Design a binder for this molecule. Sequence first.
Ligand SMILES: Cc1cc2nc3c(=O)[nH]c(=O)nc-3n(C[C@H](O)[C@H](O)[C@H](O)COP(=O)(O)OP(=O)(O)OC[C@H]3O[C@@H](n4cnc5c(N)ncnc54)[C@H](O)[C@@H]3O)c2cc1C
Ligand SMILES: Cc1cc2nc3c(=O)[nH]c(=O)nc-3n(C[C@H](O)[C@H](O)[C@H](O)COP(=O)(O)OP(=O)(O)OC[C@H]3O[C@@H](n4cnc5c(N)ncnc54)[C@H](O)[C@@H]3O)c2cc1C
Ligand SMILES: NC(=O)c1ccc[n+]([C@@H]2O[C@H](COP(=O)([O-])OP(=O)(O)OC[C@H]3O[C@@H](n4cnc5c(N)ncnc54)[C@H](OP(=O)(O)O)[C@@H]3O)[C@@H](O)[C@H]2O)c1
Ligand SMILES: NC(=O)c1ccc[n+]([C@@H]2O[C@H](COP(=O)([O-])OP(=O)(O)OC[C@H]3O[C@@H](n4cnc5c(N)ncnc54)[C@H](OP(=O)(O)O)[C@@H]3O)[C@@H](O)[C@H]2O)c1
Ligand code: NA
Ligand code: NA
Lengths: 329, 329
Amino acid sequence: MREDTKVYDITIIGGGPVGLFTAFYGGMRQASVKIIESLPQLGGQLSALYPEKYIYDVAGFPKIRAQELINNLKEQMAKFDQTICLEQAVESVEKQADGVFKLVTNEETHYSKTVIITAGNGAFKPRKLELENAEQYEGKNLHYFVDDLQKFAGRRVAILGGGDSAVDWALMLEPIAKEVSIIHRRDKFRAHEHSVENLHASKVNVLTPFVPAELIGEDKIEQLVLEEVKGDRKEILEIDDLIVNYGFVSSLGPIKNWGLDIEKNSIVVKSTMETNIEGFFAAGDICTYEGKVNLIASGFGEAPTAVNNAKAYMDPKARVQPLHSTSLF
Amino acid sequence: MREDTKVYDITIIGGGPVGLFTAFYGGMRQASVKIIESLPQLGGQLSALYPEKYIYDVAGFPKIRAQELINNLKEQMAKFDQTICLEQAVESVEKQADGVFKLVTNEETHYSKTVIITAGNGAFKPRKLELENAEQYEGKNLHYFVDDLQKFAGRRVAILGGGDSAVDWALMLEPIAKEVSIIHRRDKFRAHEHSVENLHASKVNVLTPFVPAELIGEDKIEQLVLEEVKGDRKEILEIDDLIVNYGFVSSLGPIKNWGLDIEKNSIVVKSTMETNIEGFFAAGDICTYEGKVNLIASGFGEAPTAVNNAKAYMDPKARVQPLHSTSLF
Ligand SMILES: Cc1cc2nc3c(=O)[nH]c(=O)nc-3n(C[C@H](O)[C@H](O)[C@H](O)COP(=O)(O)OP(=O)(O)OC[C@H]3O[C@@H](n4cnc5c(N)ncnc54)[C@H](O)[C@@H]3O)c2cc1C
Ligand SMILES: Cc1cc2nc3c(=O)[nH]c(=O)nc-3n(C[C@H](O)[C@H](O)[C@H](O)COP(=O)(O)OP(=O)(O)OC[C@H]3O[C@@H](n4cnc5c(N)ncnc54)[C@H](O)[C@@H]3O)c2cc1C
Ligand SMILES: NC(=O)c1ccc[n+]([C@@H]2O[C@H](COP(=O)([O-])OP(=O)(O)OC[C@H]3O[C@@H](n4cnc5c(N)ncnc54)[C@H](OP(=O)(O)O)[C@@H]3O)[C@@H](O)[C@H]2O)c1
Ligand SMILES: NC(=O)c1ccc[n+]([C@@H]2O[C@H](COP(=O)([O-])OP(=O)(O)OC[C@H]3O[C@@H](n4cnc5c(N)ncnc54)[C@H](OP(=O)(O)O)[C@@H]3O)[C@@H](O)[C@H]2O)c1
Ligand code: NA
Ligand code: NA
């Protein structure tokens, strides 16, 4: 655990499209801004689930690719400064006796005058390996997210899963690692067929249809035991690193432990976007009210409403109504 | 007075940016849509009051010219069918005994299952010439809205006003008209400095500081008499056409007589965007609620909220939540 003692004006929970636009508007209102995001990148459901698909119902865009919209939002918010904390899932939020919010994640403790939660359906997290003692190896040689390929240089690597993530990493590691195995529970892969063709074409050891049965290693994982899906046959692999790419899940989880009023598995808001905790606002798919629609356009409307009301909360002489952007730049 | 006996699903009062996106969204939800707009053009405050200016706080646009955003919205809604009624200001809205809304304008009577008012600050009207016989010439050779500039080819034109609209028309007409004069009540123009420099360098006859004194003509205007401001001098122009560019005025006007709940020139809405009259919704600058900010982004979020709740009102079996646009097309 570490601690960032700087009190930010606005801390945003979740860097999907609504959080990104919220960050922009915080900058517009001369607020210091932190974004905390569960995944190793920004973009929420758009970047995670349909980055290549076209969106037709965002105002002003006859058609726009999801990732393109996210890229536009990043460019928009780049005019201002934020501190962005990726791979952090907020698990605790408490308004302290001095009014300052304290936020705790899996990695770091943060402070803020206001919090705006833009969590969607809750934190995106990788699917964990469902083997009794898998957690023991987290922080050692069990990897869920991969960034630096060179740490696997000259090493025996096993990758679990059959999607684009598992296949892509297997192909990138083949020329770097001593040996690479990919283990998937069907003979048919879920990854793009061309990537799967290259995989079979490559020197990657493909083990299908198998599931992980056991992890062995007192300290570091040393052996991986596989079991065939149809039948009882087992295989043991000697490995230096295990990468698990089983996709992602989202849930509210600890968002329900902060004293917020929750209805429809979402955070209730007044028309100002404020929750039942003053200084704590919500926007986008995480929020609810009578007539709420879960759309990007709706969230993009909620964002400035939240930021502008947050600004008035922080500075009772600040007008909720912003000045014209046409004049300000 | 004429009557359109077709009962529309959704009829939108005002074709500013929020009414345009509302109209698009109606199409998205497979509703029959009519837009009724007071001016001879769509675009609201953007097109009328700042078409040339860059907007920076619409989600997904690092910067977009106001008129270009309007153009984008028109392209977006062109995917579906709408009935557009320009040059019609709504004077009366009544929810009849059968539940059907009856809307009466200056030109026509309309019917609708639901109404979504997107009127901003009220119906735009051009500021008119305050001379006693001026109205007599409307529909003849006195012009408040100019579309077919070619019809001024080879003609003697006088333009009234000192803003960008007047100056732009003078400069655009100079190369094709026989003669162009611009008449303004101060030696200083309100138009942009470079345009004014172009104006003085051109062959346009600039008459300042003058106001119109008299229109002469039994049928069409044949002569325009001007008088110097704070002076003792008149001028008479022989003209074929008179264009007046005195800007725009807006007010709620008869919107206050429909039995709606109104505060501070705004229609009070609950979180569903519904007014106190069931089936009658509002969005954009016209609506209010605690925390409301008059922004384009805000209005763009309110629009689909209104449409989707109007859909649920018309068919309580149909859902509020739309299917994905990524999927629908
Ligand atoms: C296949 C598909 C197609 C779609 N098509 C459309 C469409 O065409 N038009 C449209 O308008 N909508 C569409 N949607 C819905 C749209 O994706 C959502 O409305 C939008 O993603 C909501 O944005 P958001 O920022 O509120 O939430 P999200 O996109 O879910 O982002 C929230 C972010 O918050 C992070 N987060 C959450 N909790 C925490 C925490 N505790 N700590 C740290 N980080 C956290 C999450 O990891 C996530 O990155 C579609 C959805 C799907 C799945
Ligand atoms: C100079 C200026 C700069 C601005 N800069 C920004 C900016 O940078 N960013 C931002 O977000 N916002 C900005 N705004 C505010 C922005 O223009 C408004 O939020 C936006 O125009 C509201 O859109 P609308 O569709 O609700 O209303 P409007 O734009 O007012 O359109 C309403 C339309 O309804 C019509 N109408 C009204 N009543 C009737 C009736 N009874 N019958 C028929 N038609 C009717 C009117 O003629 C009008 O065309 C600015 C405003 C101004 C004046
Ligand atoms: N280059 C690219 O275009 C690229 C790169 C990375 C990610 N993506 C996209 O990002 C999204 C995420 O994909 P990603 O692979 O992380 O995740 P994914 O598509 O969800 O794939 C997860 C893989 O894990 C397997 N799995 C899950 N739980 C398991 C379990 N309990 N036991 C055994 N196997 C299990 C699944 O098996 P089953 O298939 O049998 O269900 C699947 O093969 C996808 O849309 C993907 O296309 C694209
Ligand atoms: N090319 C561009 O960039 C462009 C193009 C079109 C519009 N716009 C913008 O759109 C906005 C609207 O401009 P627009 O020119 O329609 O309108 P405008 O700026 O309001 O100008 C109206 C002109 O009419 C004059 N006027 C009004 N009533 C009068 C009266 N009774 N007698 C004499 N003169 C009268 C005003 O005089 P005074 O100046 O003395 O008040 C003013 O010069 C402006 O911000 C403009 O910059 C920009
Ligand atoms: Na929700
Ligand atoms: Na208003």
